[PDB]
């Protein structure tokens, strides 16, 4: 934004529509940083599915 | 059949509004009659449904005891009375009808609806309207066509029609819509393009008519002398 | 409230367009029938389909309603020139003790081509100055579509007070027109040098100024 000096997510383009479902679960809240830089990394995250 | 309602109506913040629901023909004292509202910005709410043959009021738990609906079986007319109007009551109500059936669902459906009664309420109540004419200048008219009209300010409530020479000028006339003000007031404009040869021979006059206020003020226009 | 709906859905004139209605397990999933309505902006809504199994008189057979578990679905085939309205969910809720409607979806991709605007700036007349008010009007006409951002300035700072924009209406020649007012007082109308209304339309910025002296 121009008047607001913060990175906000506005383009939510993940899917179009959904007709019918049964499973829906909400996990714990987690805060994230939306500002992107070009420096060196400071953390490491591993995910196993 | 067909159910006809009243027209537009404005009230005061803390007054009692009284509208009605008229039925053409019969088939009114045998089925339930409800009232469904609709406001621009949110969904459609449901206040309650009234049965006219026995007279039992059935409202909802979201609406408190501030509105009452009374029906009559002699003339087939249901009356709606509401008091203590708020700022979020600017919506339109409809006269619906319930037609029950059998089945596993057994849900209330509205097959027959009404016309619609737009009930608005705000500040800046009815007062005397002010008409201000508009004259073209020598710098704003470079060709053989000039634009001029009349400006209506400080008027309430809607609607107000604008006529030109008692409806004799139909070519090039346009009526601008109203707009909400910070004080809760409306304002509109009207302008017609006429050739420059007819400014000094044929005179123009705006006829402002207001039916709820019973004010009919006509005002003439004159061109500017300095520019 | 308890019934949510998507805000908008896109479609093509000739393919199948489906909509989904989600609620709770006590109003739609409990066993109650659903009712779909059409809210046309300018007339009263009518009945389209009740119970998702019968067809009323006067409705085409292109509408198909079904209940798949806890959610209801509405599918149409072919987009004609009358589908510019809103579709709602109505279902009987027991926790609310009555019928509750849904959110409503708008079915309209666009249809508004571009054009070149033309503005007219008109100063207040002599009779308006003694009324202790000043209504600076700025008329815009002959443009397409009706999406104009109106801004004001006094040659030294933008005016962020008393600004108003009206919605444009369709003319007789498939055009739009609107007007913008500015509420001022005659005490400071003669102190400044000039006034102007700046608007934009797809980058096209037209500027017109007047002078009170």
From Swiss-Prot, chain A:
**Region (Disordered) location:** 1-19, 28-40
Substituting residue 38 to E results in: In strain: Omicron/XBB.1.5, Omicron/EG.5.1
Function of the protein: Attaches the virion to the cell membrane by interacting with host receptor, initiating the infection. The major receptor is host ACE2. When S2/S2' has been cleaved, binding to the receptor triggers direct fusion at the cell membrane. When S2/S2' has not been cleaved, binding to the receptor results in internalization of the virus by endocytosis using host TFRC and GRM2 and leading to fusion of the virion membrane with the host endosomal membrane. Alternatively, may use NRP1/NRP2 and integrin as entry receptors.
Give the multimer and partner information: Binds to host ACE2. RBD also interacts with the N-linked glycan on 'Asn-90' of ACE2. Cleavage of S generates a polybasic C-terminal sequence on S1 that binds to host Neuropilin-1 (NRP1) and Neuropilin-2 (NRP2) receptors. Interacts with host integrin alpha-5/beta-1 (ITGA5:ITGB1) and with ACE2 in complex with integrin alpha-5/beta-1 (ITGA5:ITGB1). May interact via cytoplasmic c-terminus with M protein. May interact (via N-terminus) with host bilirubin and biliverdin, thereby preventing antibody binding to the SARS-CoV-2 spike NTD via an allosteric mechanism.
Name the UniProt record assigns to this protein: Spike protein S1
Species the sequence originates in:
Severe acute respiratory syndrome coronavirus 2 (2019-nCoV)
Residues modified by carbohydrate are 4, 20
What result is annotated for mutating residue 45 to S?
A: In strain: Gamma/P.1
């Amino acid at each position: 934004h121009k008047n607001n000096k913060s990175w906000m997510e506005s383009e939510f383009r993940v899917y179009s529509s959904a007709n019918n479902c049964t499973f829906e679960y909400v996990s714990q809240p987690f805060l994230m940083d939306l500002e992107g830089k070009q420096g060196n990394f400071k953390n490491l995250r591993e995910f196993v599915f | 059949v067909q159910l006809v309602e009243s027209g537009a109506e404005v009230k005061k913040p803390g007054s009692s509004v009284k509208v009605s629901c008229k039925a053409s023909g019969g088939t009114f004292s045998s089925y339930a009659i409800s009232w469904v509202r609709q406001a621009p910005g949110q969904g459609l709410e449901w206040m309650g449904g009234i049965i006219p043959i026995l007279g039992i009021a059935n409202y909802a738990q979201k609406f408190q005891g501030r509105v009452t609906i009374t029906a009559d079986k002699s003339t087939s007319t249901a009356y709606m009375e509401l008091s203590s109007l708020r700022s979020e009551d600017t919506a339109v109500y409809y006269c619906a009808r319930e037609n029950g059936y059998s089945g596993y669902g057994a849900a209330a459906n509205f097959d027959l609806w009404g016309r619609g009664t737009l009930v608005t309420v705000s500040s800046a109540s009815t007062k005397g309207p002010s008409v201000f004419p508009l004259a073209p200048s020598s710098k704003s008219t470079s060709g053989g066509t000039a634009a001029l009209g009349c400006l209506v300010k400080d008027y309430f409530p809607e609607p107000v029609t604008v006529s030109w020479n008692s409806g004799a000028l139909t070519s090039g006339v346009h009526t601008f819509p109203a707009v909400l003000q910070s004080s809760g007031l409306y304002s509109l404009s009207s302008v017609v393009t006429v050739p420059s040869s007819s400014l000094g021979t044929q005179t123009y006059i705006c006829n402002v008519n207001h039916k709820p206020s019973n004010t009919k003020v006509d005002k003439k226009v004159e061109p500017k002398s300095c520019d | 409230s308890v019934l949510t709906q998507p805000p908008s859905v896109s479609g093509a004139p000739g393919q199948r367009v489906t909509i989904s209605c989600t609620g709770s397990s006590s109003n739609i999933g409990a066993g109650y029938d659903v009712h779909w309505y059409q809210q046309l902006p300018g007339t009263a809504p009518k009945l389209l389909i009740y119970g998702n199994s019968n067809r009323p008189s006067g409705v085409p057979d292109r509408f198909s309603g079904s209940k798949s578990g806890t959610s209801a679905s509405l599918a149409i085939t072919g987009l004609q020139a009358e589908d510019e309205a809103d579709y709602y969910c109505q279902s009987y809720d027991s926790s609310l003790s009555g019928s509750v409607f849904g959110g409503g979806t708008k079915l309209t991709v666009l249809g508004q081509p571009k054009a070149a605007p033309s503005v007219t700036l008109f100063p207040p007349s002599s009779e308006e100055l003694q009324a202790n008010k000043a209504t600076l009007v700025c008329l815009i006409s002959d443009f397409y579509p009706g999406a104009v951002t109106v801004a004001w300035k006094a040659d030294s700072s933008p005016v962020k007070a008393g600004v108003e924009t009206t919605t444009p209406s369709k003319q007789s020649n498939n055009k739009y027109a609107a007007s913008s007012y500015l509420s001022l007082t005659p005490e400071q109308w003669k102190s400044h040098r000039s006034y102007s209304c700046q608007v934009t339309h797809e980058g096209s910025t037209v500027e017109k100024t007047v002078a009170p002296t």
